[PDB]
Amino acid sequence: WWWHLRVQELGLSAPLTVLPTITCGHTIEILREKGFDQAPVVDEAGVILGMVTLGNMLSSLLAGKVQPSDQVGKVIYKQFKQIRLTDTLGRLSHILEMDHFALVVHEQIQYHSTGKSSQRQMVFGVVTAIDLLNFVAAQERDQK
Amino acid sequence: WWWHLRVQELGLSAPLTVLPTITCGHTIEILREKGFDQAPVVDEAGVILGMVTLGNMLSSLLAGKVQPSDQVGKVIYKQFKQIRLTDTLGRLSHILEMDHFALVVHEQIQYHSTGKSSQRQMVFGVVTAIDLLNFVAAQERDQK
Amino acid sequence: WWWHLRVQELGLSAPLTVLPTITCGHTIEILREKGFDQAPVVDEAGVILGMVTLGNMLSSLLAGKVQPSDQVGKVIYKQFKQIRLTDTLGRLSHILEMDHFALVVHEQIQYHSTGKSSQRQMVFGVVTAIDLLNFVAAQERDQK
Amino acid sequence: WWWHLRVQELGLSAPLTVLPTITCGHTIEILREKGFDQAPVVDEAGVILGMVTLGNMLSSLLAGKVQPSDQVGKVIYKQFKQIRLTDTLGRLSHILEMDHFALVVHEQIQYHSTGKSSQRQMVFGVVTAIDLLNFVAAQERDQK
Amino acid sequence: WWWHLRVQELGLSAPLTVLPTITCGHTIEILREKGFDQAPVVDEAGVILGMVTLGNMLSSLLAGKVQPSDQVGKVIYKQFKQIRLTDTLGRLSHILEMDHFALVVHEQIQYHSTGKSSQRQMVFGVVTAIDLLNFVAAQERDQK
Amino acid sequence: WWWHLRVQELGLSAPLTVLPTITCGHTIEILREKGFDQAPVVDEAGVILGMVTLGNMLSSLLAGKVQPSDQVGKVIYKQFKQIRLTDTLGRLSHILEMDHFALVVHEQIQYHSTGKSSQRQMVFGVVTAIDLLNFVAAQERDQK
Amino acid sequence: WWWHLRVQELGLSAPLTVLPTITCGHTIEILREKGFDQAPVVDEAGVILGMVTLGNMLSSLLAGKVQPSDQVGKVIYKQFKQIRLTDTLGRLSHILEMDHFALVVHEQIQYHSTGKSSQRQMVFGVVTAIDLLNFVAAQERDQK
Amino acid sequence: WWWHLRVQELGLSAPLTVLPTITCGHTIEILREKGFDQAPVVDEAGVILGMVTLGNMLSSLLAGKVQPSDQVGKVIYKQFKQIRLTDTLGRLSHILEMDHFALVVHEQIQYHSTGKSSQRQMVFGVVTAIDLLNFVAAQERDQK
Amino acid sequence: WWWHLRVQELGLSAPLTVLPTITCGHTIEILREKGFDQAPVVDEAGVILGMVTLGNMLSSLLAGKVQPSDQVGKVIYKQFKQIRLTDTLGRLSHILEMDHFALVVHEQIQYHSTGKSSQRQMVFGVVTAIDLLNFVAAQERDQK
Amino acid sequence: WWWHLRVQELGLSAPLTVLPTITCGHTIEILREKGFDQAPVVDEAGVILGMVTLGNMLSSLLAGKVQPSDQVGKVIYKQFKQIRLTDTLGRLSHILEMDHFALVVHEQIQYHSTGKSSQRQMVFGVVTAIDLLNFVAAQERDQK
Ligand SMILES: C[S@@+](CC[C@H](N)C(=O)[O-])C[C@H]1O[C@@H](n2cnc3c(N)ncnc32)[C@H](O)[C@@H]1O
Ligand SMILES: C[S@@+](CC[C@H](N)C(=O)[O-])C[C@H]1O[C@@H](n2cnc3c(N)ncnc32)[C@H](O)[C@@H]1O
Ligand SMILES: C[S@@+](CC[C@H](N)C(=O)[O-])C[C@H]1O[C@@H](n2cnc3c(N)ncnc32)[C@H](O)[C@@H]1O
Ligand SMILES: C[S@@+](CC[C@H](N)C(=O)[O-])C[C@H]1O[C@@H](n2cnc3c(N)ncnc32)[C@H](O)[C@@H]1O
Ligand SMILES: C[S@@+](CC[C@H](N)C(=O)[O-])C[C@H]1O[C@@H](n2cnc3c(N)ncnc32)[C@H](O)[C@@H]1O
Ligand SMILES: C[S@@+](CC[C@H](N)C(=O)[O-])C[C@H]1O[C@@H](n2cnc3c(N)ncnc32)[C@H](O)[C@@H]1O
Ligand SMILES: C[S@@+](CC[C@H](N)C(=O)[O-])C[C@H]1O[C@@H](n2cnc3c(N)ncnc32)[C@H](O)[C@@H]1O
Ligand SMILES: C[S@@+](CC[C@H](N)C(=O)[O-])C[C@H]1O[C@@H](n2cnc3c(N)ncnc32)[C@H](O)[C@@H]1O
Ligand SMILES: C[S@@+](CC[C@H](N)C(=O)[O-])C[C@H]1O[C@@H](n2cnc3c(N)ncnc32)[C@H](O)[C@@H]1O
Ligand SMILES: C[S@@+](CC[C@H](N)C(=O)[O-])C[C@H]1O[C@@H](n2cnc3c(N)ncnc32)[C@H](O)[C@@H]1O
């Protein structure tokens, strides 16, 4: 039944993200002390530009390309199956199987001095099935 | 009953915002062509830095401080009441009671090259009672 | 300079109004898709008998007096700052300065079988600020 | 140059119209004391249901169809080269070139309880070249 | 029955007539506030030499032949058909059913020491169907 | 250099594990609030009889066998490239890449009444990349 | 210098243990032929519940409480001083210097069907100074 | 019962003994691989001049007096509860009650060139209770 | 039955040997006072370098090889069928039977500074049938 | 030189003898603690009838012919070499060489009232090479 549900309901309390210049070893700590596993990589403007995960992180360091002291900009995960918040859990349940996570985007349309429109994409969160499992374990009392 | 409803459920399709350098005259067009009157004023990084409304802009143009060719950066509406998307309708409905509009924000905590957290507030969108009315009109069908 | 202009100069094209029996939400949907905010409440004869505005409507709905399914007549915003089309832009601009909207009316005198005179008032149009702001933006391309 | 100008500029302070039930002897009187030539005929709802002119009337009286005590509604004039106030003076000029009068109208879009649109034609006023001649001496001080 | 009624018995209001030198517009604005449409042009005494109307002026002015600032002499409408006061209402019907007005003349036969018979055809006035309609309305009161 | 390091040094403070009867949703909660990802499934005697990981378990919920209220015993996950505690980081670096984790085994040789030996495998912990990733940063101060 | 060292480096390959049910004499034989002196006593679940030593044996066997053919659980040594593997070598130093043998333990906490937690204590390896002396004579080759 | 028996019956294994100058670690390894707990210290002539024990040796390094590479004559133990082969098992068992081992000695009456009598003490071997317990483990099947 | 018995169970009386540097006359003296038939000859280190018997003396004195003042090392007897202290009494009795004396030796495996294994041999004692004949009367009360 | 010596100087103090009925072990014990090997067996008057040694007695006991409890008379060794005291030491020494003992007999030459001379040969004693060895050792002191 849960696949009926929608992305926004899932409580993406995930404001955390990184710059590409963050030291690899530091991110390793932050995720673990938080218990997290993957962190979004954006610019200081917040523009979505990549990902970082242990799976590529361990693979990269063990590949010998970088040190833990290196910056994540050079080991940036980018192949995320990113989804939109407006979508349903079925798509989430679909996508979140081949890998543990996927980005949810929020779109931002700015207009220039001359009224010319522009588009900015923002991070709504970084979700995993735990959020799905956590949410599905409780909310079924209300809108099942 | 609807005041219990959760804010993110309100179907905000509101990515449009403006740079402060946009000309007032063009600004009116974009809102009026959209049927809008108020729009977020943000930087190129999406920094929540003010507003623009009907009363803000009508008073400003009638006061003569901004010509129609003037930029909105001079008269950016600032006294907006603001809510968070994780909040509830009842307070937002309360919030909308004494204003024409309300701002919803979001947060995104970037982490430095040194791994230090840095919190950035990000625009979620712009809500007027139409959004509440439009959704509660839909909730007439969804309360099943 | 524009405030000296005649009210009729603006050209408030749309004469869109409602009867006091249409469902509250239905009014809201019609205005919102078109982006409107208000609608004159007149009889089938067209006699100006009131107004309805979202600021009243949001307050009315949140007051609990009307469901969205309720009729619009019971929340008739019959009070309005009303001006005549034969009047000056500045005073209407003055009128809109501290109001969410303004009303203009069209007079009409009928003579019965005995020729005794009568008076009727039709709606010339409904004006908000963005009428003027767009109009002065357009008109200053011709007369300025 | 004036023929290019908009209809509404011509100061059409002409709200007077009659019910069809008014007698012949009173219609002539009012138009005579007003110095008028013709008078619109509408219902109590303002529906544009006819006309009456000296040419229509004189032909009617001299044909014997209406006694002076008879109603103008029996011989209600209804033909006219009707125009709408959004148009230009040249078309008004064009229409008045061969008719003995010109008719201008106005619109009102009422909406029912079911949200169904209803465009209602409404009288704006009666115009003759006097309105042109009176006002042509005026705009040659404003736009000329 | 009224067709028998004597033209003299109608009781024209009065003659109003100007000299050809004065401009059209000044005559035009005067006649209209009296409600008039057509005005004679005579010599220093009242001899028939000219005739002006709105119908020909509007036709001529929009044709561009003369301006409203042009003298009233160039808008002459003397091609009228003319009647004598000794005739009856029926003759007016045979006149006014087509034209917009009728001319009635009169003789001011003053006698002097010049030694010859004198004849000076005066203008008796300007009569329209309103006079006819007023006269038949009045005669229906006399014949009561 | 780190592959020189030995498995024993890593310090897996990982005594936590589960029974097969543990509730599915409770299982995910337990790891999540603590921030873990997977915990061994053993009996009350500590026998290494299973494993629970989100990737199978998210698939397990999507397979429909388990609701969050279900037990993990019916979806007990039992494949793991388990490593031995005496090895080096080279094996860990090798083994721990193709999956996110691997069991580390302690062993126990119990002797019967007749002196017959009996080997019993024990869980020394549950390791992922962080354990070494944190450790490699630390071990550059002690052994290298 | 070695006293600083970590216990787990000491090659504590002592998975062997006994059930209480086995006779005393065989256990003494078992440790004798394999060369040990003392062996840990646990249940079939591997729960640490006792010990057996030469003094625990000879004194009891000379006390007459047990025949050599008597069961070993009768003389289960339990007054050992106990340490955890996570400690340092100097902690072993001030343990074996007065005790004739040393016990080390490993911990394991299991989580129930209801999610409640319970710890299990598991033997790591029965160690005496020879391991230390063997290890310290060996590890200095790694350092130097 | 066995305490009535005779020491010589026990059947010692062998006299594995060392010189004082032997390295501490080599004795440590030798007793390890042999499983032994101690070894007598004698000269090349076999004179009973010392002993080396686990408790002596563990205390020796941990007191810092000898490195593992140092020679054992520095810590030469001689406080053994020495016994003679001719003595009884019960006394030996009593003798082993507090010491972890008991030296068994042997005599040799060597005469000189002049016939002067002299006694040369000889090491018969080394015994722990494990000898006795194993010894009684079989003797109860033949001499009982 | 006694032939089944063992060296150690039979037991020695006492060991007495001498250096070869003793004179022949005193060798007779010590044996004759003891009634001994023979004597082992070793160094002060106890190495079994020879022995002396009655048959050695009778041949030696009557061959003129040694005077009583001469040393036995001149004619130190060397023939002897050496036996070990592990051997069945029947063999001992057999092995003694054809000879006139027999010797049992005791092993002594000592280790050097470099821990190199080395086995020296030690004299256990001299045995004649008296050792058998006296003890056989005793073990018939112990084994029988 | 000693071959000149005689039994009269020999000092054979060997008068002890046994009866044939005495038990072998009883004779064995007596001979052993005095330290002899061979024992004379004579009648109650001292007349020569028997002789025994250990060499045959052990051999006979090992042959199974007699037990140690058997009488000494059945284990006789009379196949000795017998000598007379009048014979020189050289012949004495010569004759004892190829054995372990020799017999010397007593032939006193006085008689009694029986009326006839005869011979009742008593044993003079039991000499060994040790006697000679003791004798030659002593006589070397006497002659020098
Ligand atoms: C505690 S971690 C558990 C580790 C597991 N491998 C995973 O990624 O889900 C999961 C929780 O952390 C939160 N989280 C994941 N990524 C995050 C991020 N980049 N910033 C802040 N929170 C995040 C999610 O809301 C999720 O509920
Ligand atoms: C249809 S307009 C009606 C006029 C109304 N007074 C207003 O502008 O907010 C309102 C709708 O547009 C959306 N909206 C308002 N401001 C917006 C903005 N700045 N960018 C994008 N959408 C916006 C809101 O969600 C609301 O549902
Ligand atoms: C496209 S709408 C823009 C959205 C905004 N709510 C509004 O109505 O102004 C612009 C025009 O709608 C007109 N308008 C507003 N209320 C009206 C009403 N009740 N009937 C007809 N026109 C109306 C305004 O005068 C304005 O010129
Ligand atoms: C003052 S009369 C004089 C001109 C001429 N008598 C005629 O009626 O055409 C004409 C003026 O009266 C006004 N008028 C004409 N008919 C009208 C009517 N039916 N109701 C109100 N005003 C009217 C027109 O604006 C026009 O400017
Ligand atoms: C409004 S006018 C009659 C309508 C006619 N179409 C006109 O406007 O001239 C009303 C009265 O004015 C009078 N009248 C018309 N023209 C006149 C003139 N030129 N001088 C004096 N009276 C005039 C007529 O007698 C008529 O009774
Ligand atoms: C904060 S969790 C992050 C998620 C990680 N993939 C995991 O294994 O759960 C990382 C730490 O949790 C610890 N851990 C993992 N499984 C555990 C378990 N079953 N019991 C106790 N600790 C565990 C590991 O030692 C690791 O250092
Ligand atoms: C080689 S034996 C030497 C004799 C020693 N005195 C002792 O305590 O047994 C000692 C070795 O056996 C190992 N050991 C001790 N107890 C053991 C047990 N119960 N099972 C398996 N190994 C054990 C220890 O780690 C130590 O390294
Ligand atoms: C075979 S080891 C068995 C291992 C056991 N941990 C121990 O040392 O007792 C035990 C045997 O070795 C013998 N032994 C002990 N120390 C000895 C030594 N220094 N030289 C020769 N044998 C020794 C003991 O007499 C005992 O019978
Ligand atoms: C007591 S004498 C018995 C009678 C006779 N003298 C003989 O030797 O057979 C023999 C005993 O002395 C002991 N013995 C023999 N030669 C010895 C020697 N060289 N040193 C010490 N004891 C010896 C033997 O153990 C034997 O039990
Ligand atoms: C000391 S024992 C040992 C010598 C010899 N191997 C033996 O066993 O007969 C020998 C001495 O005892 C003495 N002797 C031998 N037989 C004897 C006997 N039957 N009675 C008394 N003395 C005897 C001899 O004189 C000799 O000096």
Numbering used by the authors:
A (entry chain A), B (entry chain C), C (entry chain D), D (entry chain H), E (entry chain G), F (entry chain B), ...: 1 to 144
What does the paper say about this structure?
Cystathionine beta-synthase (CBS) is an essential metabolic enzyme across all domains of life for the production of glutathione, cysteine, and hydrogen sulfide. Human CBS adopts a unique multi-domain structure: an N-terminal haem binding domain (residues 38–74), a central PLP-dependent catalytic domain (CD, residues 75–382), and a C-terminal regulatory domain (RD, residues 411–551)5,11,12. The RD adopts the evolutionarily conserved Bateman module, consisting of two tandem CBS motifs (CBS-1 and CBS-2) and a surface-exposed loop (residues 516–525) extending from a CBS-2 motif. Here we show using cryo-electron microscopy that full-length human CBS in the basal and SAM-bound activated states polymerises as filaments mediated by a conserved regulatory domain loop.
To this end, cryo-EM was used to analyse CBSFL-CHis in the presence of SAM. Micrographs showed that CBS retains a filamentous architecture in the presence of SAM but with a significantly altered morphology, as shown by 2D classes. Through helical refinement, we generated a global map at 4.0 Å resolution which reveals a central helical stalk decorated with highly flexible lobes. The overall morphology of the resulting filament is drastically different in comparison to the basal state, as reflected by the 66% increase in twist (−178.6°) and 10% decrease in rise (46.9 Å) of the filament in the presence of SAM. In the context of the full-length enzyme elucidated here, the SAM-mediated conformational change creates a central filament stalk composed of repeating units of the SAM-bound RD dimer, arranged in an antiparallel “daisy-chain” like fashion due to the interactions of the loop 516–525 with the neighbouring subunit. The central filament stalk is decorated by highly flexible CDs, where the active site entrance loops are free to open and hence increase the accessibility for substrates. Comparing our basal and activated filaments, the SAM-mediated conformational change to the RD is highly agreeable with that observed in the crystal structures of CBSΔ516–525 dimers where there is a relative 18° rotation between the CBS-1 and CBS-2 motifs caused by SAM binding. In our activated filament maps, ligand density was present for SAM only at the S2 site. No apparent and interpretable density was found for SAM at the S1 site nor at the filament interfaces. Overall, our data suggests that CBS likely binds SAM in a 1:1 manner and that our observed filament structures only reveal S2 as a SAM binding site.
